[PDB]
């Protein structure tokens, strides 16, 4: 299973957080299996049905 | 379910701890012998009142008085090269 590099997540400032515009708490919740994140959503299908 | 489950859970935990707990792996059939020797040593220590010599362990474990030395020498765990030697934090083994 893929594993993130500790240097680029738990750093001050966090580089993954800056790249993805995510707060460090959100990253810690996601990558340590505490919260789900929507990777993508089909907006075209939702707007039709 | 709490009886069969208990049996299987205990077996799995014990077998895994026999395998994945030593830097130098020892087979389960010898980990059992080491544990038995330790238990017999504890019982002899309680009974005699002094530290039991290899002679007593040989009689109470129905093995040769030489295999006990090999068993005790297989139980050594390697030390770490990164442990501090002095009082401050500038020296290592």
């Amino acid at each position: 299973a893929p594993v993130t590099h500790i240097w680029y997540f738990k750093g001050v400032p966090s580089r993954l957080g800056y790249l993805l515009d995510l707060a460090p708490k959100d990253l810690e919740k996601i990558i340590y299996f505490a919260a789900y994140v929507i990777t993508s959503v089909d907006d075209e299908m939702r707007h039709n049905e | 379910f709490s009886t069969y489950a208990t049996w299987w859970i205990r077996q799995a935990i014990t077998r895994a701890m026999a395998d994945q707990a030593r830097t130098i792996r020892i087979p389960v059939h010898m980990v059992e012998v080491i544990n038995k020797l330790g238990r017999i040593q504890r019982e002899l220590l309680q009974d005699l009142g002094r530290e039991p010599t290899p002679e007593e362990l040989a009689k109470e474990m129905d093995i040769t008085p030489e295999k006990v030395l090999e068993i005790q020498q297989y139980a050594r765990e390697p030390i770490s090269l990164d442990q501090t030697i002095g009082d401050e934090g500038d020296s290592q083994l």
Binding site: - | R42, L45, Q46, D87, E88
Partner: protein, 292 residues
């Protein structure tokens, strides 16, 4: 994190009327009580439980049991005989009674809060209800009345206590697995942890050192040495220019001359010639009483 002390007082079973009638001599306590924004007792107890143990679903009895375990039980809190004596002397509580209990009590907490508020106001005296009047003043942590001495016996006793705790854990583990009517004292007691702890202390602890044997004076001074370093003590790096000083309370108890001149200056010393040791671990010195 910080929480107003009124929440803690209400969680201890007190009400608004109790706080008003108890701390009615002050102003900061009233201001804190007006800004508590928490009424009743259950709400404050739930807030304390949420702050102390996040992530655990709270119930009614769990918070009370947690508070009792934290402060008012012998299992996980132990103000030792030294600590009990110091608290009694400082707050003027239980004057005369023998030192039997060794745990904190609500009376001690309320006395501490009252002492703090009266010290902040500026009063130089305070009498706890059902207590003896004591002066109100700040404490110097470097005073020799606030620094005690753990001798060899106390360190060995602590190691024996650790070993006995491990042995008790093993005994409790073995009690529920063996069959009743066949359990005997010798089939439950594993003596190995106790002797292991003693050996670990004598062979690993920083306070157990090789004897100096250059000359008789080396050994004599080695046995009379007071060290501030070790388990539960300071470190040679995390110690500023405050503890490495000759306090005026060292007269007749600690020598101001004999100390290492390297990086351990002031952290190691020697007993004076006439100095003794109290049963509580404090250092006593003799004086001749004069009259008229």
């Amino acid at each position: 994190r910080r929480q107003p002390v009124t929440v803690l007082l209400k969680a201890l079973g007190w009400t608004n009327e109790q706080i008003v009638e108890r701390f009615g001599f002050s102003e900061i306590m009233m201001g804190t009580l007006e800004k508590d924004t928490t009424s009743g007792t259950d709400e404050a107890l739930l807030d304390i439980y949420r702050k102390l143990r996040p992530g655990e679903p709270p119930t009614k009895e769990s918070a009370q049991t947690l508070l009792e375990n934290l402060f008012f039980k012998e299992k996980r809190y132990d103000l030792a005989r030294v600590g009990r004596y110091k608290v009694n002397k400082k707050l003027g509580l239980n004057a005369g009674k023998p030192i039997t209990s060794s745990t904190l009590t609500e009376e001690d907490v309320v006395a501490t809060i009252e002492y703090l508020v009266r010290l902040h106001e500026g009063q130089t005296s305070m009498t706890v209800p059902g207590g003896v009047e004591v002066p109100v003043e700040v404490d110097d942590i470097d005073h020799f009345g606030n620094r005690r001495l753990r001798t060899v016996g106390e360190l060995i006793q602590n190691q024996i206590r650790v070993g006995l705790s491990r042995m008790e854990r093993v005994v409790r583990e073995r009690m529920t697995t063996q069959d009743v009517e066949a359990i005997t004292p010798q089939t439950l007691i594993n003596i190995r942890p106790v002797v292991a702890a003693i050996k670990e202390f004598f062979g690993t602890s920083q306070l157990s050192q090789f004897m100096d044997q250059n000359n008789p004076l080396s050994g004599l001074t080695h046995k009379r040495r007071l060290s501030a370093l070790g388990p539960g003590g300071l470190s040679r790096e995390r110690a500023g220019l405050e503890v490495r000083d000759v306090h005026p309370s060292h007269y007749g108890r600690m020598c101001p001359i004999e100390t290492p001149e390297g990086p351990n200056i002031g952290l190691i010393g020697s007993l004076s010639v006439y100095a003794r040791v109290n049963p509580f671990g404090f250092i006593e010195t003799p004086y001749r009483k004069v009259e008229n």
